[PDB]
Homo-oligomer: A and B are copies of this chain.
């Protein structure tokens, strides 16, 4: 040995870079780790491997060891001199062990360590100055543990950290300046905890934070500390118990791109709450009954998808579409809308859903110049009259739903050759509709069957599999019509 050592018995070795060795001794059911172990090792995998105690017979001098994996072992503790000779250690993996605390001194002064995995353990205590002397540490996993409180003291030295996970723990409170010194931190995961109360200055530390995950938690109020994270881009606090989004909630966080707050019992949202988020692309608000006014979206014109349902919106501003260019899908279903704005300024609109509103009439300009619009749903309204030219300028329109709207007649100008047409619930609609001036219709809903009767009722390899599936759907589909 001492230079000429072979591949450890029962293990599997393989060359890395020239004169460097990768040793795989995973799932061999070792009681203790390999004995006569070789220098030139740059990768050591001992995983799922019944190691009760790492050694009485230490193996330093592996100064070329880049990566140590010690997962699925039965380690209850880590001795102080365990990782002494490992000067080139970049990544250490210690997940799925029975560790009850971060090694008090064993992890100290590993100069080159960049990523540390201590997840899936039983750790409940994180001794201060256990991470002391880790200048290269960028990534820290501490999830699926039994933590109760943020180790603010232990975290105070890791000013080079970029990514941290404290998920799947039992953390209930976040004190002020809990992550004070973590200035380089970019990604913080606190999801699946028991966080009920957090301080007002609890996030004041991390200036470079871009994503914050407070999902699957127990928040009763919107976390206002959020206001201090200027560089924040992604925000998650869904599946909590938050009741409302306050006015000026994301004021401190422009350049936000995604926000997740679903599975929250949200009833009210401030009007100016979603102002000044120009990088935001999608806004979804379902079942916020206490909303009585359409939200203001000044300085956030890059919305592509706006859906807001189950509220009490009585009317839309005349110049509502002035705030919404680039908008593709609009869904104001289940509201109390009577009059409709122009919607012409809202080009690039592809889909519109206004069902279950109190709309009594469709004007001329209310749908003019929507050349990209494909789907229009106005079902379950009280639309007595439609202007003849209302749908004159919608070439790309293919789906139209006018179900249950007490209509008697119908505008046929334009609208020729669409794909879906739904007219059930309009009892006063008894006249006939031709197969001509209506080709390409494939799905039809009709108030009366005799109207349905008028429509004839009574190179690459193996991608051909895919072509077969595309061709299966169409052409096997004949014209449908339900009365």
> Judging by beta carbons under 8 Å apart, are A263 and B406 in contact?
yes
Q: Does A436 contact B (CB under 8 A)?
A: no
Give the size range of A's interface with the partner: 20 to 34
If A239-B428, A263-B406, A263-B427 touch, whether A473 touches B462 (CB-CB below 8 Å) is no
Q: Are A406 and B239 in contact (CB under 8 A)?
A: yes
> Whole-angstrom distance from the CB of A261 to the nearest CB of chain B?
12
Shortest CB-to-CB span from A480 to chain B, Å, is 10
Instruction: Report A440-479 CB contacts with B as 1/0, cut-off 8 Å.
Output: 0000000000000000000001111110110011100100
Return the CB mask of A251-287 against B: 1 if under 8 Å, else 0: 0000000000011010000000000000000000000
Which chain B residue lies CB-closest to A461?
B462
Closest 8 CB pairs of A and B: A462-B464, A263-B406, A472-B477, A466-B468, A469-B477, A263-B427, A461-B462, A464-B466
Question: How many Å lie between the Cα of A382 and that of B462 in the bound state?
Answer: 45
Choose among B216, B310, B427 the residue that contacts A262 (Cβ–Cβ < 8 A).
B427
A sample of 8 more A-B contacts (CB under 8 A), given A239-B427, A310-B356, A465-B466, is: A238-B427, A239-B428, A263-B427, A265-B382, A461-B462, A462-B464, A464-B466, A465-B473
Q: Evaluate whether A464 and B463 lie within 8 angstroms (CB atoms) in the complex, with A239-B427, A262-B427, A263-B406 already known.
A: yes
Q: Given B238, B468, B474, which contacts A473 in the complex, CB threshold below 8 Å?
A: B468
Which residues of A, 399-437, contact B by the 8 Å Cβ criterion? 406, 427-428
| CB of A382, distance to nearest CB on chain B (Å) | 8
Q: Describe A's contact surface by its main secondary structure.
A: loop
Q: How far is the CB of A224 from chain B (nearest CB, A)?
A: 25
What are the residues of chain B within 8 A of A472 when measuring CB–CB? 474, 477
Chain B CB count within 10 A is highest, among A216, A239, A461, A462, for A462
Give the distance in Å from the alpha carbon of A477 to the alpha carbon of B471 in the complex: 12
A5 to chain B, nearest CB (A): 44
Q: With both chains docked as a complex, state the minimum distance between the C-beta of A406 and any C-beta of chain B, in angstroms.
A: 5
CA distance A461 to B466 in the complex (A): 12
List 18 A-B residue pairs with CB atoms under 8 Å apart, sorted by A's residue number. A216-B428, A238-B427, A239-B406, A239-B427, A239-B428, A262-B427, A263-B427, A265-B382, A310-B356, A462-B462, A462-B464, A463-B464, A465-B473, A466-B468, A468-B473, A469-B477, A472-B474, A472-B477
Q: How far is the CB of A415 from chain B (nearest CB, A)?
A: 25
When chains A and B are docked, how far (Å) is the Cα of A464 from the Cα of B459?
9
Nearest CB of B to A285, in Å = 14
Considering the chains assembled together, what is the distance between the CA atoms of A422 and B474 in angstroms?
A: 24
Which residues from B are CB-within-8-Å of A382?
Answer: 265
| Closest chain B CB from A136 CB (angstroms) | 34
Give the docked Cα–Cα distance between A465 and B472 (Å).
Answer: 12
Contacts of A461 in B (CB 8 A): 462
In the complex, how many angstroms separate the beta carbon of A85 from the nearest chain B beta carbon?
42
CB-defined contacts of A406 to chain B, threshold 8 Å: 239, 263
Shortest CB distance A429–B (Å): 12
